[PDB]
C-alpha cells in the first residue's frame, strides 16, 4: 500500500535537504577561509550530519524496495496456486497469461536485491531460487494442462504436484534470501574449506605442531588420534564406495595405515621432548614425516575422485534412452525395471559429485556442485513419471511431447553437473587419468577382437567412444577460459583431429569387426587396421594432453634451467600459479603495511620479518620464472635460509613470551610461533619435490604443477604467520616485566620504536586498507 | 599540518558541493511527484553519488587528523626525553612547563581517534596508553628532579629511567593504536564490547539460534568448529589460571567437553540434512541442548570469575606493608625478597581483573577495569624502587616521604581497581560465592579449634574477617545507588549488625581461643561460644544476602513486512503460534487458581504472558509492536520481569520442602533465564541494518520462527515456576506476617 512506508521517505528527503543546506554554507565559509581551524571542524561536523541523513534515506528506500518485492512475491505465489487448481484449459490459459508478466516483474526486482545482498553465499542462493521459479512456471503450465486432458493418469498428477512443490519452494527461497542481512566477511586465513574432509585434513596439519603433553591440549582438546580417525572414516567412504577401483581402494587403505603409523611415531617422540628447551631434532623429523603422509593421503584421495569422474561421467544418458524406448514401446513393466537402473545411475552421478566436493577447498565451486546435484535429484523422479505416463499411453501425443521435454531437460541438467565437477577438479589430472583408462580400454578392445568376443568389442568400444568424447568436451570448454592464439590453436587442432578423423575411423573398424564376426562362419577381417585405428585413439588423446601441457619458449636438471622452464610453462599452468602468487601478494602487502609503521635499529624481529619476506618472494618469483633462483639447488638453500631466520625469530618470540606475565596475551604469540615452525617445515619439503618432465612424441612436457602450487601455498601461509607474530610480539612486549628468575633480562633485547610521521607511507597504508 | 591534504580536502569539498546540488534537484522533483517511480530512482542514485562524495571527504579529513596526531606525538616524545636529560632544576622546570600543554593537546587528539577506531581492543590500548602517559608525565618530573638533588643515589636514576621507559612505551602505544587497521582476520573484530570471550560466546549463540540454511551447509561446520574452539581457548585460560580452584577447574573442563559433544550431535543432525525445507521437529531439540550447554559453560565461567574476586581481593596491601617495613629497617635483601612477593600478588590482582573483563558484556565497565589495571601495572615497579631506595638510605627523610606517597598511591589505585571489578560483576553472584566461602572457612576455623591448631585458627579467622569486611564494603557502596526506603535500611541494618556486633564477638572468641591454646592444653576455653560466634558470621552474611535480594530490580515498520510473508512461511508461523497458545491456555488455567491477585509472582506471570503474546502477534503480524525497535524493547521488558520473578523464586526457594521441589523450582528459574536470553537474541540479531554493524548472517523469517519457539518455551517455563510455588508463596507470606507477597521498589539516587 506504501501509505506510511513511502511517507517516511518524503520526510527523510527533507532532512537530506535541510542538512544539505547547512552543509553548503559551512562548506562555503570554509572555502573562503580554509586555514581556519574552527570553520573547518564546522564543515566536518556538517558533512557527518549530512552523511547520517543520506544513509537513513538510502536505508529507508531499500526497505521500501524489499517490501515491494515481498508483495510481488505473494502475487506470483497465489498465481501459481491458481494455475495449479485450474479446472478447464480455458481458465488455465487465462491464468498463465495473467501470471507470466507478474513472474517477469518479480524476477527483475529479485535480480536487483540479489546485487544489494553482501553475503556472497546468498547471492548465488537468490540466483538459484529465481532461475528455478523462472524455469518451472511454464513447465507447471504444460503439466497441469495434461492432467486436465488425461484425468485418469495418476502419473501426470504426481508429476504436476512435484513441479508445484518445487515452485513454492523457490518462492519461499526468494523470500528467504531477499531478507538476508547485513555485512559479512569471508576468511582468507584461515579459510575457506568447502569440503568436510578437505577442512578436516587441513585442520589436522595445524594440530600436529602444537605440544599435546600440556593440560590445555590433553584435558581441553580432542586428541590427534580422534581427529585422524575422523579423516580415516572420511577416506573410508572414498575407498569403500562402489564406483572406486580395487587398485585405488588398496592405495587409500595403505595410505591410512601409513598416516596412522606416522602419528604413533610422533606421539612417542612428544614424550621424548618433555623438556621443550631445545626442540628435539628427532621430533622435528617426526613432524616432517607426519606432514608428508597427510599430503600423500590427500593426493591419493584426489586421484580417487579423478577415477570416479573418468568412469561415471561417460555415456550418462544411456539408461534414459533405454527407459524412453521401453516407454515408447508401451512396455509397462520394462519401464519400471529401467527406471530403477536410471535412478541408480543418477544416484551414482550424485555420489561422484559429493565425493569430489569432500576434498575441494573451492568453497564457491563446491556450492555450485551441491546445488546442481540437488536439482538433478529433484528432476530424476519427474523424468521417471514422464516415462511411466508414456508407457501407459505410447500413442498419446502429449506423452510423446512431455517425454521429449524431460529428455532434453535431463541431458541439460546432467551437463550442468558434470561441468560443475569439472570446475573443482584439475584438467591435468583428468587428462592423465583419461589417458590411462583409454589405453586400458583399447587394450581390452583388441583382446576382445582376438578372443572373437562381439559383446566385449561393442562394450569396450562404447567406453572408448564415451571417454574420448568426454575428453574433447572437457578440453574444448577449458580452451574458452584462454585468450585465442598459438596455444589454443594447436590444442583445438588436436581435439578436432580426434573427433572428426580418428574417432570416426575407429568406429568404422569396430563396426566392420562386429559385422565380420556376426555372420557364421567368421568372415575375413583386417586385424591390422583395427589395431592401428585403436592405437590412434590413444595417440589422439595423448596428443591433446601434449598440447594442453605443451611447454614452448617464444610467443608471436635435464634441458634448460629450473627457472627458465617455469617461465615457458603452458598458458593453462601459467594461470593457476599467477592466481596463487596473487593470493600470496595479498598476504605480502599486509606485512609491508605492518612492518612500515615500525623502526628497527634496535629491532631484530622486524628485520628477520623483512629478510624472510625477501627470500619468501624469491621462491614465488622462481615459480613465476622471474626469480633470481636459477636451479632447485638455489630453492633448497632459500627454504633453508627462511628456516634459519624462522628459528632465530622463534628464539626472540619465546623470550618476549617468557617475560610476559599475562598468560592470555602470551598464548596468542606462542601459537603463531608454532605456525611459523610448521610452514617453515612445509616450505622445506616443497623445495625437495622436483618439477618432473615427461614426453612420448619427443617434445618435453611437465605434467601437473601441484609441487609448485604447494610451495606458494606454504609461503602465503608462512607470510600470514610472520605478520601475526610481529603483531603479537609487540602486544607481549608492552606487558614486559623485570626478570628476577629465568631468563634474566631487565631491559628488553628488541626495541619497539614507531616510525616518524611521514606523508607518503601514510597515504599508501590507507589505499591498502581501502582495497 | 601537511598541505597536500589541505589542498586535496578542498577539491573534495567541491565534489560534495556539486553532488549536493544534483541531489537537491532530484530530491525536489521527487517531493513534488512522490508517487513517481522514475523521479524516485533518480533521487536514490543521486543520494548514492552524494554518499560516496561525503565519505571520500570524511575519510580524507580523518587522515589529516591522524597525521596531525602523529606530529603532536613526536613533539611530546622529544619533550619527555628533554625532560629526562635536564641538568638543572632550572631547565627541568622550564621543560615541564613547555611540555605539560603539549601533553594535554596530544591527550585530546588521542581521545578523539580512540572513538573512531573500530575494533575495541585498539580502543583499549589507546585508553590505557593515554592514561599512563597522563599520569607519569608529572611523576617523571618529580623523579628526574630528585636525581638532580641526590646525584649519587643510583636508586633514583634507576627509578627515573624506568618511568621514562614506561612513558616512551605509552607514546608508541598511542601511535600504534592510532594507526589501527579496521580488518584483521577478515573483520572478526567486535567493535562493540566487552569481553573477547563474552562476545565469542554470544556470537556462537546467534549463529546457532537463527541459522536453518535450507539450501546447503557449506560454512556451517567450519565456522562453528572454529568459533567453539576459540571459546574453548578462552575457557582454558580461566581454568588453567593459578588463582582457580581445582574443584572449579574440573567444572569448566567438564563443561567444555559437554558443549563440544553437544555440537557434534547437532552437526550430525545437519550432516544428515540434504534438501530439507524446515525439518524443525527433533532438530530444534539438538539446538535447545546446544543453547543450554553454552549457558551452562558461561555460568561456570561467571562463577569461576567470582571465585577469583572472593579469594584475591582479601589482603591487598599486606605484601606492601611488609616490603615497606624491610625498607624502613634498611634491609636491601629482605626488600628484594618481598618485592617479588608484592609483584606476584599485584600480577594476581591484574590477572583476576582481566579475567573478569573477558566475560563482561559491559563495554564501558570493562574499559575502566583495563585502564585501572594498566595503571596498577605501571605503578608497581615504581613502588618497588621507592622501597629499594629507602632500603639503602632508611634515615633519608626524602626516601621516607617518597615511600609514603607511593604507598598511599598504591592503596588508592588498588581500591579503584577492585571497585571497577565490583562494577562488572553481579552483587548477587558475589554474595552467593562469599556465603559459600564463609561457610567453608568457618568450618575450617572450628576444625582448627578441635585440632588445637593455633596457626590454622589465626589463618582461617584472618580469611573470615577479610571476606566479611569485603562483603560489608561491597554491599554498603552498592546501597549508594538507591534511595532510602524499607529496602536500603533493612540491608544496612543487616550490614551494621555484622560489622558492629557479629564480627567483634567472633574476633574476641578467636583471640581467647588462641590465647588459651597458646598457654596449656586442653579446653582452657568454651568451645560452645566459639562455635556459636563463628556460625553467627555465616548467619550474618546469609542475612545480608537475603536483604539485598528482597527487591524490585529497576528495521522500521517490520510488522508490515511480516504481513506480506509467503503462505508456506505464514502457515509454519500459524502452527507455532497455535503450539504457543496451547502453553498459554495452561498458564491462564493455573494463574486463575491463586488466592492472591496483588502478589508479585502472579502479576509478573500475567505481565510476561501479555508481552509474550504481543511478540507472537507481531510475527502474524497484527501485534501492537510496529517494528524491531518495539520488539527489542518487548524482549527487554520480559527480561526485566523474568529477573524480578527470579528474585521472588530465590527468596521463596527455602520455603518449598522435600529438597526435590527446591531443585525443581530453581531449575525452572534457570529455564526462564535461558529463554529470556534466547528471546533477547532473536530481537537484537534482527537489528543489524538500522545501526552499524554486524559480523555474520541473520534472516528475518528465520529469526521469527526461533522467536515464537523461544516464547513458547518461556511460556512453559513460567507455568512450571508458578505451579512449583503455590504452597511456598503462602508459607513465606505467613512467615513474615504479610497480607500479600510484595517486594519494594527503590529508584536510583541523584
Curated annotation (Swiss-Prot), chain B:
PTM annotation, UniProt: Sumoylated. Phosphorylation seems to contribute to the strength of cell-cell adhesion rather than to the basic capacity for cell-cell adhesion.
Biological process, per Gene Ontology: apical junction assembly; axon regeneration; cell adhesion; cell migration; cell-cell adhesion; cellular response to indole-3-methanol; epithelial cell-cell adhesion; establishment or maintenance of cell polarity
Effect of mutating residue 237 to S: In MDPT2; no effect on VCL-binding
Signal peptide (UniProt feature, chain positions): none
Membrane topology according to the record: Peripheral membrane protein
A GO-annotated cellular component: cell junction
KW Cytoplasm (keyword) present: yes
Location relative to the cell: Cytoplasm, Cytoskeleton; Cell junction, Adherens junction; Cell membrane; Cell junction
Top-level taxon of origin: Eukaryota
Involved in homodimerization: annotated segments: 1-147
Main location per the UniProt record: cytoplasm
Cross-link (Glycyl lysine isopeptide (Lys-Gly) (interchain with G-Cter in SUMO2)), chain numbering: 686
Pfam families (alphabetical): Vinculin (PF01044)
Residue segments, region Interaction with alpha-actinin: 244-313
Recorded GO MF terms: actin filament binding; beta-catenin binding; cadherin binding; gamma-catenin binding; identical protein binding; RNA binding; structural molecule activity; vinculin binding
Keyword match Acetylation: yes
Region feature (Interaction with JUP and CTNNB1): 16-67
Residues modified to Phosphoserine: 183, 187, 214, 216, 740
Family, per entry: Belongs to the vinculin/alpha-catenin family.
Function: Associates with the cytoplasmic domain of a variety of cadherins. The association of catenins to cadherins produces a complex which is linked to the actin filament network, and which seems to be of primary importance for cadherins cell-adhesion properties. Can associate with both E- and N-cadherins. Originally believed to be a stable component of E-cadherin/catenin adhesion complexes and to mediate the linkage of cadherins to the actin cytoskeleton at adherens junctions.
Disease tied to this entry: Germline CTNNA1 truncating mutations have been detected in patients with hereditary diffuse gastric cancer (HDGC) and may play a role in disease susceptibility. Diffuse gastric cancer is a malignant disease characterized by poorly differentiated infiltrating lesions resulting in thickening of the stomach. Malignant tumors start in the stomach, can spread to the esophagus or the small intestine, and can extend through the stomach wall to nearby lymph nodes and organs. It also can metastasize to other parts of the body. Macular dystrophy, patterned, 2: A form of retinal patterned dystrophy, a heterogeneous group of macular disorders caused by abnormal accumulation of lipofuscin in the retinal pigment epithelium. Lipofuscin distribution can show various shapes that define different types of macular dystrophy, including reticular (fishnet-like) dystrophy, macroreticular (spider-shaped) dystrophy and butterfly-shaped pigment dystrophy. MDPT2 is an autosomal dominant form characterized by bilateral accumulation of pigment in the macular area that resembles the wings of a butterfly.
Protein name, entry field: Catenin alpha-1
Upper classification of the organism: Eukaryota, Metazoa, Chordata, Craniata, Vertebrata
Gene name as annotated: CTNNA1
Amino acid at each position: 500500500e506504501s501509505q506510511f512506508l513511502k511517507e517516511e521517505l518524503v520526510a527523510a528527503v527533507e532532512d537530506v535537504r535541510k542538512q544539505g543546506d547547512l552543509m553548503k554554507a559551512a562548506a562555503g565559509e570554509f572555502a573562503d577561509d580554509p586555514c581556519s581551524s574552527v570553520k573547518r571542524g564546522n564543515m566536518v561536523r556538517a558533512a557527518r550530519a549530512l552523511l547520517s541523513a543520506v544513509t537513513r534515506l538510502l536505508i529507508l528506500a531499500d526497505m521500501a524496495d524489499v517490501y515491494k518485492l515481498l508483495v510481488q512475491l505473494k502475487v506470483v505465489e497465489d498465481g501459481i496456486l491458481k494455475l495449479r487448481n485450474a479446472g478447464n484449459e480455458q481458465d488455465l490459459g487465462i491464468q498463465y497469461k495473467a501470471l507470466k508478466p507478474e513472474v517477469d516483474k518479480l524476477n527483475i526486482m529479485a535480480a536487483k536485491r540479489q546485487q544489494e545482498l553482501k553475503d556472497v553465499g546468498h547471492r548465488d542462493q537468490m540466483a538459484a531460487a529465481r532461475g528455478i521459479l523462472q524455469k518451472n512456471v511454464p513447465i507447471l503450465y504444460t503439466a497441469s494442462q495434461a492432467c486436465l486432458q488425461h484425468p485418469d493418469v495418476a502419473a501426470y498428477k504426481a508429476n504436476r504436484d512435484l513441479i508445484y512443490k518445487q515452485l513454492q519452494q523457490a518462492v519461499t527461497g526468494i523470500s528467504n534470501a531477499a531478507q538476508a542481512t547485513a555485512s559479512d566477511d569471508a576468511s582468507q586465513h584461515q579459510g575457506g574449506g568447502g569440503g568436510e574432509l578437505a577442512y578436516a585434513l587441513n585442520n589436522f596439519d595445524k594440530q600436529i605442531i602444537v605440544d599435546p603433553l600440556s593440560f590445555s591440549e590433553e584435558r581441553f582438546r580432542p586428541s590427534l588420534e580422534e581427529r585422524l580417525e575422523s579423516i580415516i572414516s572420511g577416506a573410508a567412504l572414498m575407498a569403500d564406495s562402489s564406483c572406486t577401483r580395487d587398485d585405488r581402494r588398496e592405495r587409500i587403505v595403505a595410505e591410512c595405515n601409513a598416516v596412522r603409523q606416522a602419528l604413533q611415531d610422533l606421539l612417542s617422540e612428544y614424550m621424548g621432548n618433555a623438556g621443550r628447551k631445545e626442540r628435539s631434532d628427532a621430533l622435528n623429523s617426526a613432524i616432517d614425516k607426519m606432514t608428508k603422509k597427510t599430503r600423500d593421503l590427500r593426493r591419493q584421495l584426489r586421484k580417487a575422485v579423478m577415477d570416479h569422474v573418468s568412469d561415471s561421467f561417460l555415456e550418462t544418458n544411456v539408461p534414459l534412452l533405454v527407459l524412453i524406448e521401453a516407454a515408447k514401446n508401451g512396455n509397462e513393466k520394462e519401464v519400471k525395471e529401467y527406471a530403477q537402473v536410471f535412478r541408480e545411475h543418477a544416484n551414482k552421478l550424485i555420489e561422484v559429485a559429493n565425493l569430489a566436493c569432500s576434498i575441494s577447498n573451492n568453497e564457491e565451486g563446491v556450492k555450485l556442485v551441491r546445488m546442481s546435484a540437488s536439482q538433478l535429484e529433484a528432476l530424476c523422479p519427474q523424468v521417471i513419471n514422464a516415462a511411466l505416463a508414456l508407457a501407459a499411453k505410447p500413442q498419446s501425443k502429449l506423452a510423446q511431447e512431455n517425454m521429449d521435454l524431460f529428455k532434453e531437460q535431463w541431458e541439460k541438467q546432467v551437463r550442468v553437473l558434470t561441468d560443475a565437477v569439472d570446475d573443482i577438479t584439475s584438467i591435468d589430472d583428468f587428462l592423465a587419468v583419461s589417458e590411462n583408462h583409454i589405453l586400458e580400454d583399447v587394450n581390452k578392445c583388441v583382446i576382445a577382437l582376438q578372443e572373437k568376443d562381439v559383446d566385449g568389442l561393442d562394450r569396450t568400444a562404447g567406453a572408448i567412444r564415451g571417454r574420448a568424447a568426454r575428453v574433447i568436451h572437457v578440453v574444448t570448454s577449458e580452451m574458452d577460459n584462454y585468450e585465442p592464439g598459438v596455444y589454443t590453436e594447436k590444442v583445438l587442432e588436436a581435439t578436432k583431429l580426434l573427433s572428426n578423423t580418428v574417432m570416426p575411423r575407429f568406429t568404422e573398424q569396430v563396426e566392420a569387426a562386429v559385422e565380420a564376426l556376426s555372420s557364421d562362419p567368421a568372415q575375413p577381417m583386417d586385424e591390422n587396421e583395427f589395431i592401428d585405428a585403436s592405437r590412434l585413439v590413444y595417440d589422439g588423446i595423448r596428443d591433446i594432453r601434449k598440447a594442453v601441457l605443451m611447454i614452448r619458449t617464444p610467443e608471436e636438471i635435464a634441458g634448460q634451467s629450473a627457472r627458465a622452464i617455469m617461465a615457458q610453462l603452458p598458458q593453462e599452468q601459467k594461470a593457476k600459479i599467477a592466481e596463487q602468487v596473487a593470493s600470496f601478494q595479498e598476504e605480502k602487502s599486509k606485512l609491508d603495511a605492518e612492518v612500515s609503521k615500525w623502526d628497527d635499529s634496535g629491532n631484530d624481529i622486524i628485520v628477520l620479518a623483512k629478510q624472510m619476506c625477501m627470500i619468501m618472494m624469491e621462491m614465488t618469483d622462481f615459480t613465476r620464472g622471474k626469480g633470481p633462483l636459477k636451479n632447485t639447488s638455489d630453492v633448497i638453500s632459500a627454504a633453508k635460509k627462511i628456516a634459519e631466520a624462522g628459528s632465530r625469530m622463534d628464539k626472540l618470540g619465546r623470550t618476549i613470551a617468557d617475560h610476559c606475565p599475562d598468560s592470555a596475551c602470551k598464548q596468542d604469540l606462542l601459537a603463531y610461533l608454532q605456525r611459523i615452525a610448521l610452514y617453515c617445515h612445509q616450505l622445506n619439503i616443497c623445495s625437495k619435490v622436483k618439477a618432473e618432465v615427461q614426453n612420448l612424441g619427443g617434445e618435453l612436457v611437465v605434467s601437473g604443477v601441484d609441487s609448485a602450487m604447494s610451495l606458494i601455498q606454504a609461503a602465503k601461509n608462512l607470510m600470514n604467520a610472520v605478520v601475526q607474530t610481529v603483531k603479537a610480539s609487540y602486544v607481549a612486549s608492552t606487558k614486559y616485566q623485570k626478570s628476577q628468575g629465568m631468563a634474566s633480562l631487565n631491559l628488553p633485547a628488541v626495541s619497539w620504536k614507531m616510525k616518524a610521521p611521514e606523508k607518503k607511507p601514510l597515504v599508501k597504508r590507507e589505499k591498502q586498507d581501502e582495497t
